[PDB]
Write a protein that binds this ligand. Structure first.
Ligand SMILES: N[C@@H](Cc1c[nH]c2ccccc12)C(=O)O
Ligand SMILES: N[C@@H](Cc1c[nH]c2ccccc12)C(=O)O
Ligand SMILES: N[C@@H](Cc1c[nH]c2ccccc12)C(=O)O
Ligand SMILES: N[C@@H](Cc1c[nH]c2ccccc12)C(=O)O
Ligand SMILES: [Mn+2]
Ligand SMILES: [Mn+2]
Ligand SMILES: [Mn+2]
Ligand SMILES: [Mn+2]
Lengths: 449, 449, 449, 449
């Protein structure tokens, strides 16, 4: 310690630190404090002007002018944080985004689960055998031994390193022309040709191909077409890591603000959601755009209570409310939440997370999600919006560009016996690359009708 | 007289003047010579750099990279050469061009029957009552009296005036934003909504609407989208008018060339087509891009003979061969012509004129064309190209943006009793504005499959 | 007659026609009425959207964001209305405009004395020998005989024809790439190299050359650089010609307006300036942007009276006040006019006409202007603005791209004995092409300091 | 170990490893091998398409169409690798680049000493007291103790982390609009206003300000103006670190190549320059663009021998030869080197390093460089090129955006007693931020004449 914040925020800051943080690591305090003091001076993962630029883009999503595509790994691992893997995830993210853009007929803003998504809350404190379980590479190792599972503050520094590496690469990839949409559509036509249900989406695939041909015929210069913007996001979970990445930034107008520059967009989880707990108060204090995970037990009245705390100046696009209710309960629970939140005067982004609501333990033993149920939660998410006359702001999916077999269903007909063929996820099951693109086509079809 | 041309061309020029010109006016020579000497010094209707730019664009059409949309009034009249009329024709030309662009998936180059299309050859020398018939406003008046029907050299000057007025307006209209394609599509959706066979083209209309939305979502600046290029063309027919508009122009590289700057593109007619007559030799000598009307009696061997004379340096896009064979004879006659011309080493533009081949005298008395037969000649024109593996370069139609009833058929079901309701053409019957747009949709559908 | 205007304007229209028009032709009424009825239906020289676009650009000039370059022939002639002559005038206009743009560091909006500047008021009713003098090619011929000098209504139609020809060409020239500023600067460096006072402007010429190199080095696409906008203007003088070119136009918002579409910008002359005469009331009624010539006898109070009549809604850039006071009287008279007009709440364009104030009969007999005096009126025009803290809006000069010798002075040292070497003007003496470019450099230097 | 390279390169690779590397660290082999195996799988600092794009840009520099601005810290430190410091260096790099662009009248390609410049060769093996000296943060610590000075393989991983952090930030900064040249010029005018020799460069500063105003007046869209490309470079020195960052990359055409993706451009030093030593053979094998430091003892014949080895296919821009000869010896030695290298058929980039040739120990005790001598080596570098008629390709300077006092001279008159006021460099003395910008202005002035 040494630098104090300005007098408006310092009282609110100490008030925030004092709250109970759930899902935190048990480790040495003096050591973890040193790691935080080190990370207080490093280069941030993002810069304030990019966060301001995102808030303007997310305002367009809230007001109905754009769509939000968020997704990536469930949990990144240091082992998996490689050039081929990041390339593959960036590819599918963009490949989906172009199809989503055609269907929605609006800008698709691309957020990624990347450059920080290491912390993993989904766990019971202690595992079988009386051995503490894996809480993400920022806390401990995947190795099932008391040596590796020991909580290690140094992993915060390892995580920051891997985050800055990852974000460096996505910036590089996007500028160097792997986000050129003529090439992306060429890959999308290779998916449609080689998919078992290929002719079932070939109507829309040829139709996108016509619009891209049409663009070139009208004589447009690939000016904004040659490179795109992939923003980055993770669940703000570790008190130490997120408080270490706090930075001040003087706005170009004149006034200064406080950002958590660990990512562009941070989000609060289902388990860490308490109104008087740390994470909500941390969120309310930082000027980053913010998400909040919302499950079946949400009442309309406390969804408004969140919006009042997290969006205290009614800035459109600031708060994003993320429905993760399961395919059954989304039609039932959501309409009351939208009606009440809309009535209170908050233009939030209504985002669908059809992943963390539909997770079940299969007959095989492996944890899985069935594709058809994932799609159905989004199907019902749109139905709620169409019927209420509000704007479906975005999706939030967990995927990988690798040819893995973690979710059931899809075009390739992934059964229970296919699951141990290739399974690489650090926690939740993710959409196979085919299933990622297939989802995009169906969500595009939902955006049309 | 006073200026002689350079020694290469002067021998070829005098050789050209010496040939027989068919379809010429009977009038005073000394007087018509004065009119020509006056028009030798006026501003031209176009400038050489625009003609060079067209030859590059027409080369793309010949090599398969673009499409050619040519059309307008059959014969312009001084009475009809007005702001609302020219606007309407420019509108439909552009409205068609955008649909044709989507279907073809290539640039549609827009040529118009405008700014010079006054001469009209379709006539028997003398009419009933022993009274000379209307040969176009550049020769005599529409008024059915020996006073007005007298051949008047001064009408060449009147024609040049009206031409320069018309081309001034189309330039103005195109630059001032009546060629903004977002507005054009908004008019195309008003056509599809209000047409009796509206839902029969609404598949493609919504699909074009999606591509335009998609363009805006991808974040393209309306840079080349806000204004387009409409070129101008007429049938080079009057020796005096066309020889008066001859101009030299030093190319930016260094060498000089000889253009007939009465229009961008000139074309030779069916009646004026003799290999040793004036018009073909005039054409061969001028550096303008050139068309040539081709009917059923064409043999493959003399189509090659034309191409050798008119395109002596195998410049792709220079000659355009225009099939006007009738809906029956186009499948039969055309394949032999394409095979032979392609074999000889000439990349010409294969253009379809489904108008001047399908003209019949109706039971009413009025001269008409049936829509279905016009479409069918184009249908068969593409079939010949699809089967032979050559590129269908363009269409050549006669239309008007006015709500007139001159052709039978179409969506609105124009019968013989509808014909005297509104009939405004100086010679041939033209496509109703609905029929013009309807044709575009069907020719677009032919360009896809 | 047949069409009546809407009830707001019709009372004001008949009120306007009823006023005395000065400087009008003596000719047959029934005949001149026929000519007007003919011209009521022709294509206009410009279209309303271009006039609206100009009013927006002229608003930027009034508010200090841009400069106005107006100029061309003093009087166009049908004999002089040719491709080489129009090209030369368009060239110098643009060549000046690029230098003026660098000096002013703002957009130079290009207006031209073209496509209508045929009427010429500067004359005594009857000439020597009791023979009526030349009042411009729209009224009578230059030929010094009672045959040609007879006033001929038909010349209005001849004038419209020549106007539409001229404007067609300038549109063509500007779009076809003779307004590409890399080529224009290459011509400007040929002027500076070959001028006798070449090294006296070579500081600024190299400095403009550096900025153009710099533009290309920064990697700018010649998008708005390849083609420019030359607008057209003349003195609204003939009642018949100007009232015949009146057109209505529905604004894109909804409301309709009344334009004189003979040109983009019309202007009122010194002789035709009466507050209750025709021309001021005609001007006030038409939605075109308007100029008004102002000489030494102007009092500040009646300059405000004009502004209230001509700019009744305080639309910036609508009225342009044109100082033509002579090199001596401009410092004296102008400051009071600016102070009063600015105080009244009118953002007009303060334009300098250093031509029609400094015209004297030389010792040779020929009417001439001395270059140094022309420059000095502009020098003093800026001094008045610099001292008062107002914006010098533009210049208004009479020039020709031909190598003529009409004004004295300049770099080439044009004496009285040089004047009969080559003299081609229909009325006032014009700046030699060197003198035009030289003026631009000096006015640029005045715009800097 | 596990992956072998393709059979063309593997023989050349093992041949390269076998050579003597000078200036290497003494540390544990098995441990340093582990660090290398770890870094073999991480994300690279750059991607092959950016390196290809640089080689195209560096080809333009070699052929005379562009200039190369290389520079930054002499040695980066982990302590100094912060957001404010990197921002400051990026700022001055860009601020110089815009002035250099105006003077050169060509694209300035921006390379930086960043994201890897940690190794430092300038040292005697052992220091005073029998204690090993600082060889850069990638090898050991600055702390003057045997604990910190111990050679630590782990610092390679620390270095990679800090490199990926730095490059992430420069990418972020450049895209987020701190490379908008209107803002950069506003900072350049604040330098010129506040510099003691302010009016001595105010001629050029106003002249650049005029060109930027002119750009905006001509109506250019800030498309390529809003963001720029800063590439990254360091001295390829540590065998382990550089061999660990080797990656293969399939070219978009088809063929594959081998890059050291630790940076975009790598360069060989004066001490590590042996023709049969590791670094030259490593360089020759990698497809990165390559530099080579050249001092007074260079003979023309061995400069050709380098060029034949490093540029074996005469690819223009591939090799960059960097003259670091001192202000006296550059005029003498360089001309023979250029003549011979040019004669052999190699279009290399002739770059000037006026820093590492002019380093002397001052009377104070501190190591310094005098500004005037630095400038003079560049002055003579251009003189050699002007006289020989070859292209001066670029500069290579050591600077910092911090207000430090390390070099003598400049506008602020830095004497020996000023040196201990603020001195922050890990090795060589760097240009003060004023001295950096001042140098740019003078090198710009040299590029003009
Ligand atoms: N840069 C634009 C267009 C674009 C480029 N690549 C894309 C991929 C997907 C969607 C859009 C794009 C955007 O981000 O919207
Ligand atoms: N200027 C482009 C695009 C365009 C604008 N308006 C159009 C109307 C129809 C077809 C294309 C266009 C072109 O001529 O191709
Ligand atoms: N089109 C821009 C730039 C331009 C092109 N040519 C010019 C000639 C002179 C001045 C400006 C220009 C303009 O009118 O301002
Ligand atoms: N992007 C262009 C122009 C540019 C933007 N910022 C700059 C700063 C310096 C020099 C040039 C630029 C370039 O790199 O050349
Ligand atoms: Mn998950
Ligand atoms: Mn016809
Ligand atoms: Mn005059
Ligand atoms: Mn150094």
């Amino acid at each position: 310690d040494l630098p104090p914040l300005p007098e408006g925020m310092q009282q609110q800051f100490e008030d925030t630190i004092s709250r109970d943080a759930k899902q935190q690591p048990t480790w040495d305090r003096a050591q973890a404090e040193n790691v935080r003091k080190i990370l207080e001076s490093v280069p941030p993962i993002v810069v304030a002007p990019e966060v301001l630029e995102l808030k303007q883009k997310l305002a367009d999503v809230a007001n109905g002018k754009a769509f939000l595509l968020q997704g990536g790994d469930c949990a990144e691992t240091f082992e998996s944080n490689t050039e081929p893997h990041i390339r593959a995830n960036v590819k599918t993210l963009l490949q989906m985004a172009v199809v989503l853009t055609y269907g929605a007929s609006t800008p698709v803003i691309k957020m990624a689960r990347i450059a920080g998504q290491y912390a993993k809350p989904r766990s019971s404190d202690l595992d079988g055998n009386g051995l503490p379980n894996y809480r993400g590479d920022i806390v401990n190792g995947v190795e099932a031994t008391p040596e590796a599972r020991r909580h290690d503050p140094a992993r915060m520094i390892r995580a920051y390193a891997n985050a800055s590496a990852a974000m460096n690469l996505v910036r590089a990839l996007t500028s160097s022309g792997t986000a050129d949409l003529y090439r992306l559509s060429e890959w999308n036509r290779e998916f449609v040709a080689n998919s078992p249900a290929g002719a079932r989406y070939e109507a829309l695939a040829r139709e996108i191909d016509s619009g891209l041909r049409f663009m070139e015929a009208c004589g447009v210069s690939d000016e904004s077409l040659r490179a795109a913007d992939i923003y980055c996001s993770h669940e703000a979970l570790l008190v130490d890591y997120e408080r270490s990445m706090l930075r001040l930034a003087t706005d170009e107008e004149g006034n200064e603000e406080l950002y958590d520059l660990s990512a562009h967009q941070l989000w609060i989880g289902e388990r860490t959601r308490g109104m008087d707990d740390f994470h909500v108060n941390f969120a309310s204090m930082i000027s980053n755009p913010i998400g909040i995970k919302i499950g079946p037990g949400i009442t309309p009245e406390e969804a408004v209570a969140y919006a009042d705390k997290l969006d205290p100046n009614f800035e459109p696009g600031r708060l994003t409310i993320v429905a993760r209710m399961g395919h059954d309960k989304v039609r039932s629970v959501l309409p009351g939440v939208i009606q009440a939140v809309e009535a209170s005067g908050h233009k939030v982004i209504w985002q669908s997370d059809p992943m963390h609501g539909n997770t079940f333990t299969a007959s095989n033993g492996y944890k899985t999600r069935h594709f058809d149920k994932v799609i159905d939660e989004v199907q019902g998410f749109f139905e709620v919006h169409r019927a209420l006359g509000t704007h479906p702001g975005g999706i939030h999916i967990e995927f990988t560009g690798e040819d893995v077999t973690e979710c059931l269903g899809g075009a390739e007909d992934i059964t229970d016996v296919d699951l141990p063929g290739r399974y690489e996820s650090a926690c939740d099951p993710r959409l196979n690359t085919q299933q990622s693109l297939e989802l995009a086509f169906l969500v595009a079809e939902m955006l049309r009708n």
